[PDB]
């Protein structure tokens, strides 16, 4: 069977969420050496802004094919399911996500692009995974200040919801889940609120120190990955 | 009458907020050559912190005595009765206090001690004095955002409220009164919320910015002006 055909299928095992029969056909293709199939079919769907690929690589991550995750898709995959210490780099102005070093009254810590810290501490996240209902969605860890990124109830006059870091995820707006894309280099995601499906972003509005707070924005997305997805970077 | 004694008549009527008193006796006073009774007593008032003192100066200032407020008291009086355009300088630290650029939701602009800016239009401010029920109060007027600092509803886990810029004051959270304060050659204030009757304060956690969030502070801040108290400086 031609690589095309077994592109193909595995692409549409994917695209239907029968991850189970995407690992399988995988693990086959792996072993097979045609592990260019798996490859072609994370480029397709990166390129499709398929979301069903972060489940895909997570059942594969569980199922005992961490090696296809590794060999496979774009490093930032590992490095999500590794849960490894990450920056969130805001595409369009290049900064990292952290949190104020103070509270914000009852909020938590205020999340924000900083305006200046590329690389302390403060940047550092770690994305926790967890399965429910077909589905990956993440908690976003501040491994700093050990809390949680999460999506106030409250909107400005747009609808947008601030974002804060807090202690605890006891809510859908402390979990978040991702869309991957690809913008010429570099593969993106857009992150969105479980509670809200608004994405992450940075305001518009800079502030006197070079920060932008961050929002779940309320508007449209798709199509703007330079404008409104986040690189993963290893810390 | 010996000056000994009409600065103890002065003193005490507005130790006991009869400020139609005290006014008639200044007036007197200034003109009957006998300014220095005057300067003795809010020196007196400013040293025992008594907020009374602020509601003198406005009833001078309302009655026709703009005059005594000007020659008799620290400028800082002057500054905040002629809504001149000044800067909130907290001692501690050394920061003015400013908005921050974007909105925090219907909290409104989040108020902070710049680590840097000490001289930007941002930093400018207004007071716009009130009376009511015998008490001056004061709407904190950010000249270029055309917001008033008010206290936010919810507290940090001390009980401490966030300052933020709002566009009206429809609240006594965006009220404010002042009890001045001596420390060395400063005349300080500290700025307490008419609601809530905290401090206004700066956080002692700094920013990476070196900015410093402003606090409705829940705690003790009388005896201790260098830590908690505002200096009040004409904006160049």
Same mark, same amino acid.
């Given at each position: 069977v031609p690589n095309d055909i077994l592109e193909e299928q595995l692409y549409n095992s994917i695209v239907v969420a029968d991850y189970d029969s995407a690992v399988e056909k995988s693990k086959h293709l792996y072993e097979e050496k045609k592990s260019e199939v798996i490859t072609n079919v994370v480029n397709k769907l990166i390129r499709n802004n398929k979301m069903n690929c972060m489940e895909y690589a997570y059942q594969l991550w569980l199922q005992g094919s961490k090696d296809i995750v590794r060999d496979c898709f774009p490093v930032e995959f590992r490095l999500i399911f590794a849960e490894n210490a990450i920056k969130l780099m805001?595409? %369009?102005?290049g900064l990292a996500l952290t949190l104020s070093n103070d509270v914000h009254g009852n909020d938590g810590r205020l999340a924000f692009g900083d305006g200046?810290?590329?690389? =302390?501490?403060? @940047?550092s996240w770690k994305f926790i995974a967890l399965w429910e209902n077909n589905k990956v969605y993440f908690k976003?860890? *501040?491994? /700093?200040? *050990?809390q949680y990124l999460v999506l106030g109830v409250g909107t400005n006059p747009n609808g947008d919801h601030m974002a804060f870091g807090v202690? =605890? @995820?006891? =809510?859908? %707006?402390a979990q978040w889940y991702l869309q991957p894309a690809k913008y010429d280099k570099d593969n993106l995601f857009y992150i969105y609120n479980r /509670?809200? =499906?608004?994405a992450l972003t940075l305001s518009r509005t800079l502030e006197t120190s070079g920060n932008r707070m961050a929002w779940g924005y309320n508007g449209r997305v798709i199509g703007s990955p330079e404008h409104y997805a986040w690189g993963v970077k290893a810390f």
């Open positions: 805001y595409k %369009r102005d200046k810290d590329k690389t =302390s501490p403060k @940047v976003i860890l *501040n491994t /700093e200040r *050990n202690n =605890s @995820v006891d =809510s859908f %707006r /509670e809200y =499906s608004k």
